């Protein structure tokens, strides 16, 4: 990679990787393609990022929220349950740990495994409460792509934050677990069960 040194030294794998490939903590944004139709444009992956933290303005407009890098969309939704409100440094490290955990098992750039668990828990259709006179039936509705990524993000983190509650396993161990089961969905994960149950109730009224 044609190394270099000026006065204050820059470490070797730091010197190396960045200049060549612009990659994660260390992980590949190349390859890692969204495994389901749609869900692209609504999952980021390129532009690549070093670590998930940003000053990003994703609020000011309706759909620029989707343009947020997807991993930071996963970290952002970690830090909450108001004791943890704020504390993105807390979450970012849990994610780096989490990714390292998933990486350990079954190879697979874990950023891609994260891409897989999001695609696999998004409900294709759901139900809402129609008035229709008081006692309210359920008009099944297909749900938007943005709400399929959003709900997956919320469903995954919540199920791990709720499971990791009151036990030795760390958040990053359950976060990774919950993702590992949902990357190819095994229906052992909190998230998958709720996805399949919503899609069951939507099928059961129509």
């Amino acid at each position: 990679f044609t190394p270099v040194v000026l006065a204050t030294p820059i470490p070797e794998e730091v010197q190396q990787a960045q200049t060549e490939i612009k990659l994660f903590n260390k992980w590949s944004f190349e390859e890692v393609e969204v495994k389901d139709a749609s869900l692209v444009d609504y999952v980021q992956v390129r532009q690549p990022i070093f670590v998930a933290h940003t000053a990003g303005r994703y609020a000011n407009k309706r759909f620029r929220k989707a343009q947020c890098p997807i991993i930071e969309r996963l970290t952002n939704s970690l830090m909450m349950n108001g004791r943890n409100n704020g504390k993105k440094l807390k979450a970012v490290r849990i994610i780096k740990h989490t990714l390292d955990i998933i990486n350990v098992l079954t190879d697979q750039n874990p950023i891609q495994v994260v891409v897989d668990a999001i695609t696999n828990t998004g409900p294709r259709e759901d139900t809402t409460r129609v008035g229709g006179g008081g006692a309210a039936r359920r008009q099944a509705v297909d749900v938007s792509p943005l709400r399929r990524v959003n709900q997956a993000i919320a469903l995954l983190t919540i199920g791990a934050r709720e499971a990791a509650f009151r036990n030795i396993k760390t958040i990053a161990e359950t976060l990774a677990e919950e993702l590992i089961n949902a990357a190819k969905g095994s229906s052992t994960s909190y998230a998958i069960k709720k996805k399949d149950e919503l899609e069951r109730v939507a099928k059961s009224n129509r």
Partner: protein
Amino acid sequence: AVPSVQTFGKKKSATAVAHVKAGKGLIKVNGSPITLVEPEILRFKVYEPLLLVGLDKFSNIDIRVRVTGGGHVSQVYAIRQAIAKGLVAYHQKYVDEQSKNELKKAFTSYDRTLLIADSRRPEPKKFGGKGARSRFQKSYR
């Protein structure tokens, strides 16, 4: 005198002043090498300008930055801005234009407001609540 430029960058309150002079390539933050900087998960945020434009850009220039004010994160975003603004301010007055408009182009592409100071800022809270938007609580009767 040697060729030098001063720059700065700001995030929230934090202001990070920079000095870019022709030199052997030290990169230092307040007293210390850019390889410390910790919070340390954020470290690559301040690495970012060196890497996006390639590490060889710093061999003819010395880099020092002092961050007063802000907080343990805003300081990291204030420095990285002064570093990139300083690298581009140097090719403004010293090496030619086409090299500078090539640097801005490759910071702006990726970016995170690297040449451009973010506008966000605390809103004043107002009476009736503990927050800016937040009101307190009411039970009616």
